[PDB]
Write a protein that binds this ligand. Structure first.
Ligand SMILES: CCCCCC(=O)OC[C@H](COP(=O)(O)OC[C@H](N)C(=O)O)OC(=O)CCCCC
Ligand SMILES: [Ca+2]
Ligand SMILES: [Ca+2]
Length: 137
């Protein structure tokens, strides 16, 4: 999709419960010596002072176009309207720290107005916490 590849997500707020479906990613950047990477996605409601909202998909080894097809749920509170859903793809490494691969983020309020669905461009770690860029086709 651009620089760091793209990911297909679905996310709609339907209770005070936030539903997110991580489907698959494409054209991820190789973060390993063998020209590949072992991606997994981390979901978090930010800011998260106590580190209590971290959810994570399974890790898929040796691939740059993973298919997780995994879903998650977040119980929401009124204090969560100002927070953002953080979606980061990381590369699992055994003998060193994992390598950041790409990210995005949606404002909870944003998702309440209209659900997210489709391909999104993967951004850098710092900017990832501030916005998302959808991709058509
Ligand atoms: C028992 C070990 C096992 O299967 O994988 C070890 C891992 C994860 O390795 P990589 O996924 O980065 O790639 C493996 C690789 N370096 C590559 O370039 O693909 O950690 C390392 O950085 C060391 C990796 C070695
Ligand atoms: Ca790596
Ligand atoms: Ca790895």
């Amino acid at each position: 999709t651009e620089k760091r590849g793209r990911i297909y997500l679905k996310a709609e707020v339907t209770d005070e419960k936030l539903h997110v479906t991580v489907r698959d990613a494409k054209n991820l950047i190789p973060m390993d010596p063998n020209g590949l990477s072992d991606p997994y996605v981390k979901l978090k409601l930010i800011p998260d002072p106590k580190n209590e909202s971290k959810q994570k998909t399974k890790t898929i080894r040796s691939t740059l176009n993973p298919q997780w097809n995994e879903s998650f749920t977040f119980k929401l509170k009124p204090s969560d309207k100002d927070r953002r859903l953080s979606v980061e793809i990381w590369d699992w490494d055994r003998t060193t720290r994992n390598d950041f691969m790409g990210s995005l983020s949606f404002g909870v309020s944003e998702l309440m107005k209209m659900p997210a669905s489709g391909w999104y461009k993967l951004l850098n770690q710092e900017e990832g916490e501030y916005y998302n860029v959808p991709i058509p086709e």
